[PDB]
Amino acid sequence: MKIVYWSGTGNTEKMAELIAKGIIESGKDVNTINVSDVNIDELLNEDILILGCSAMDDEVLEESEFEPFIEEISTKISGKKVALFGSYGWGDGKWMRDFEERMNGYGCVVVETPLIVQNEPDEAEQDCIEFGKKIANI
């Protein structure tokens, strides 16, 4: 499987690493890829797309790299399974509710409840690992 993410200070990156750890612990292989290094064509062959991005202002996806990526793949992912995650700061998850609505709008099947964590995982570490285990059970 593959995990694609954008992280500005490392919070979401840390989540990505933990989610990957859960998938691997379940006996499966997974590669984490920063959005700047992703190859679209290779990503489109995946069964499940695991995507992550922190909340930028105001309650939107990161604009310079992550959103353009989402826009680019939007017309090629109908029927695909996706799992969403991200770290946020002061909000209540509005950016994620919108991210989930958007992916469903493109015809994607959002397989699990999106995982959101405030700031760095730390206390939510096991939660991240378990989220990965849930995805490996799909």
Ligand SMILES: Cc1cc2nc3c(=O)[nH]c(=O)nc-3n(C[C@H](O)[C@H](O)[C@H](O)COP(=O)(O)O)c2cc1C
């Ligand atoms: C310019 C900017 C705008 C932000 N806007 C929001 C926001 O609208 N809602 C929110 O909850 N957090 C907001 N945050 C906080 C980040 O989502 C939060 O610090 C998160 O932990 C960053 O994770 P990352 O290191 O993976 O980027 C913003 C951060 C930055 C730098």
